[PDB]
Design an enzyme around this catalytic site. Structure first.
Site, mmCIF file in Angstrom:
data_model
loop_
_atom_site.group_PDB
_atom_site.id
_atom_site.type_symbol
_atom_site.label_atom_id
_atom_site.label_comp_id
_atom_site.label_asym_id
_atom_site.label_seq_id
_atom_site.Cartn_x
_atom_site.Cartn_y
_atom_site.Cartn_z
ATOM 1 N N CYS A 1 26.623 55.763 69.526
ATOM 2 C CA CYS A 1 27.124 56.547 70.640
ATOM 3 C C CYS A 1 28.596 56.877 70.457
ATOM 4 O O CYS A 1 29.365 56.108 69.898
ATOM 5 C CB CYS A 1 26.876 55.803 71.935
ATOM 6 S SG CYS A 1 25.133 55.830 72.351
ATOM 7 N N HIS B 1 29.395 54.449 79.093
ATOM 8 C CA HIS B 1 28.690 53.176 79.071
ATOM 9 C C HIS B 1 29.326 52.169 78.106
ATOM 10 O O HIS B 1 28.769 51.060 77.965
ATOM 11 C CB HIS B 1 27.192 53.372 78.791
ATOM 12 C CG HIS B 1 26.835 53.726 77.370
ATOM 13 N ND1 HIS B 1 26.488 55.001 76.994
ATOM 14 C CD2 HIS B 1 26.686 52.952 76.268
ATOM 15 C CE1 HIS B 1 26.154 55.001 75.707
ATOM 16 N NE2 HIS B 1 26.284 53.774 75.241
ATOM 17 N N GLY C 1 25.075 51.514 68.254
ATOM 18 C CA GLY C 1 26.435 51.674 67.832
ATOM 19 C C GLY C 1 26.837 53.096 67.483
ATOM 20 O O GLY C 1 28.017 53.341 67.231
HETATM 21 C C1 LIG Z 1 24.680 54.150 72.021
HETATM 22 O O1 LIG Z 1 25.240 53.528 70.866
HETATM 23 C C2 LIG Z 1 23.140 54.000 72.125
HETATM 24 C C3 LIG Z 1 22.335 54.883 71.142
HETATM 25 C C4 LIG Z 1 20.754 54.560 71.140
HETATM 26 C C5 LIG Z 1 20.403 53.265 70.408
HETATM 27 C C6 LIG Z 1 19.203 53.580 69.555
HETATM 28 N N1 LIG Z 1 19.195 55.031 69.379
HETATM 29 C C7 LIG Z 1 20.130 55.646 70.288
HETATM 30 O O2 LIG Z 1 20.311 56.845 70.344
HETATM 31 N N2 LIG Z 1 22.737 54.243 73.513
HETATM 32 C C8 LIG Z 1 22.119 53.336 74.267
HETATM 33 O O3 LIG Z 1 21.822 52.228 73.821
HETATM 34 C C9 LIG Z 1 21.748 53.717 75.717
HETATM 35 C C10 LIG Z 1 22.724 53.098 76.710
HETATM 36 C C11 LIG Z 1 22.557 53.632 78.155
HETATM 37 C C12 LIG Z 1 23.514 52.909 79.130
HETATM 38 C C13 LIG Z 1 22.741 55.162 78.256
HETATM 39 N N3 LIG Z 1 20.388 53.223 75.972
HETATM 40 C C14 LIG Z 1 19.323 53.764 75.294
HETATM 41 O O4 LIG Z 1 19.376 54.735 74.546
HETATM 42 O O5 LIG Z 1 18.171 53.111 75.538
HETATM 43 C C15 LIG Z 1 17.021 53.455 74.747
HETATM 44 C C16 LIG Z 1 16.988 52.647 73.453
HETATM 45 C C17 LIG Z 1 17.864 51.568 73.262
HETATM 46 C C18 LIG Z 1 17.828 50.823 72.074
HETATM 47 C C19 LIG Z 1 16.910 51.156 71.072
HETATM 48 C C20 LIG Z 1 16.036 52.227 71.251
HETATM 49 C C21 LIG Z 1 16.070 52.975 72.435
#
Ligand SMILES: *[C@H](O)[C@H](C[C@@H]1CCNC1=O)NC(=O)[C@H](CC(C)C)NC(=O)OCc1ccccc1
Ligand SMILES: *[C@H](O)[C@H](C[C@@H]1CCNC1=O)NC(=O)[C@H](CC(C)C)NC(=O)OCc1ccccc1
EC number: 3.4.19.12
Lengths: 302, 302
Positions: free
Chosen positions: A145, A41, A143
């Site tokens: 990931c 992603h 950030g």
């Molecule tokens: C990658 O950096 C990120 C890690 C999330 C951000 C907050 N805590 C985490 O573990 N992953 C994502 O943003 C992910 C992207 C998708 C295309 C897989 N989306 C996600 O985890 O959505 C839930 C979320 C996003 C932002 C804050 C809290 C939960």
């Protein structure tokens, strides 16, 4: 003496963390030999993340669209491929700090160390268990990931986890280093359920053994039980059922303490049925299940 | 989101750990520039440890009696000195991996990462708070002395702790890197008391703020209190008294959550007087006091 949740020394992994940018998306990559691994992603815009068609999105991308930085040093990308939910970026320089390593798919109930990273720079290290429902209870922000989970055996780093997503419940999910998710999850920003979160029985027992080893013995009792009797209690309490393999795994700790496993089970049963009465075990007021038997042995023998 | 006890990445410190042997005693040393620091009881035999005269014991020792190994590489010792409870061994080779570093004496209530080591090789990393009574709750076995505690600020390692001894209560004590013990302890194998172990109030409040930040809010209430009213409750519960400096330190968290510090104090008071009713906060059934405000901010902002 003493018993603490302990991570592996992280230096070998620190030397593999790089920053990967595609468009306005930045996350971490893992640089081993001449390959950089990261969550696919990284190619999405915030809009694409609700329902991404990763094949179509990737096709608009060329090597020069992947910016890979190791420290202040930019790396030259010469190839790219998608393997399940990870990208592999081929670079022209092998990482001179590549440790001996392997990729492994851990089993539920096993533990590993997470090296939490932002913009390719290590932030902190902590232990996690892969829970029976294929989630972990970590600390991850935007950030993070591409941060990875690992174990170390003398000199060999076994990578087992790459971070991708946080569930509505606040627990964390991700893939192995071939990009296959642990659990029934997909990399799309949609509501996703992990299902019931059961307790790792053999690890609770290991930690009770660790407690006895460290002088905490008040919860021991004059009773015993049977595997089938105990398991009927584990059922009520969403504990995983105990098996002879678990008994065998506990053998070293059972013998090193003189407490038959089923005697320890009988103690656990009374703790489950009667609570802790405001007391603590190894500094905790709940039953802890994120220590494996190996974790307890490794730490009680240096 | 999520909140976890997190250590610093340990790579910079891993590169400084060496093995120091004198006679039949082996422990860890810290190698920085051309100096190796270690606990002076490396010169004792098991008999000497009950009442050692370190001056007399040291005098029978010459440079070639200190065996210093970095990995498989033996180092040549050209000088030795005793500074308080540590030895400084001068070697002929500066450590090529010396990080930027300083020696600091931490204050009670501050935290740091321990890199637990045996035979000069890192075993694991974990966070510790220097408790008000100058003890820490670690995990240390025979051979772990010379393991160090540290903080990292971007690129500078601040060493603050070197491990020496375990008290009858199972808590752990040691020195700064000038060899002065934290607390009223001496390096002799005799019974020694640390005195009452009070709770770090400002850290409990920081962790309650961390809990709110992470969605745990059930313990919030409609009440407030005064500093003098709250402190009368801290007294009964062996909490450290709260001060305006503590209030000021909490400001960023107070403002980032909209909860006045004294409103949070009122919640703490009810938790102290009424218990947790079998509920949990950030996965814990007790009030946690080993997170500083800086710890909470650093981790809730990457
Ligand atoms: C990658 O950096 C990120 C890690 C999330 C951000 C907050 N805590 C985490 O573990 N992953 C994502 O943003 C992910 C992207 C998708 C295309 C897989 N989306 C996600 O985890 O959505 C839930 C979320 C996003 C932002 C804050 C809290 C939960
Ligand atoms: C240094 O390697 C060692 C660390 C002790 C061993 C067990 N847990 C620790 O933290 N320090 C000593 O052995 C120390 C030596 C004196 C000369 C300062 N003595 C000590 O801590 O005695 C208490 C004790 C010894 C062995 C097992 C349990 C407690």
């Amino acid at each position: 003496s003493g018993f603490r949740k302990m991570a592996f020394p992280s230096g070998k992994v620190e030397g593999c963390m790089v920053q990967v940018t595609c468009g306005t998306t930045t996350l971490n990559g893992l640089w081993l030999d001449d390959v950089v691994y990261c969550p696919r992603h990284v190619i999405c815009t915030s809009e694409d993340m609700l329902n991404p068609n990763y094949e179509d999105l990737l096709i608009r991308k060329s090597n020069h669209n992947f910016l890979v930085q190791a420290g202040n040093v930019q790396l030259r990308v010469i190839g790219h491929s998608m393997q399940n939910c990870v990208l592999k970026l081929k670079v022209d320089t092998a990482n001179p700090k590549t440790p001996k390593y392997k990729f492994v798919r851990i089993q539920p109930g096993q533990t590993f160390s997470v090296l939490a990273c932002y913009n390719g720079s290590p932030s902190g290290v902590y232990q996690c268990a892969m829970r029976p429902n294929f989630t972990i209870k970590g600390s991850f922000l935007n950030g993070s990931c591409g941060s990875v989970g690992f174990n170390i055996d003398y000199d060999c780093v076994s990578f087992c986890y790459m971070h991708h997503m946080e569930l509505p419940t606040g627990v964390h999910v991700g893939t192995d280093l071939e990009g296959n998710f642990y659990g029934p999850f997909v990399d799309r920003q949609t509501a996703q359920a992990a299902g019931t979160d059961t307790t790792i029985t053999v690890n609770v027992l290991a930690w009770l053994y660790a407690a006895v080893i460290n002088g905490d013995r008040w919860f021991l009792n004059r009773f015993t039980t049977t595997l089938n009797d105990f398991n009927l209690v584990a059922m009520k309490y969403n504990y995983e059922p105990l098996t002879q393999d678990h008994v065998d795994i506990l053998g070293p700790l059972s013998a090193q303490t003189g407490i038959a496993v089923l005697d320890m089970c009988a103690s656990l049963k009374e703790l489950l049925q009667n609570g802790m009465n405001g007391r603590t075990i190894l500094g905790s007021a709940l039953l802890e299940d994120e220590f494996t038997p190996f974790d307890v042995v490794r730490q009680c023998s240096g």
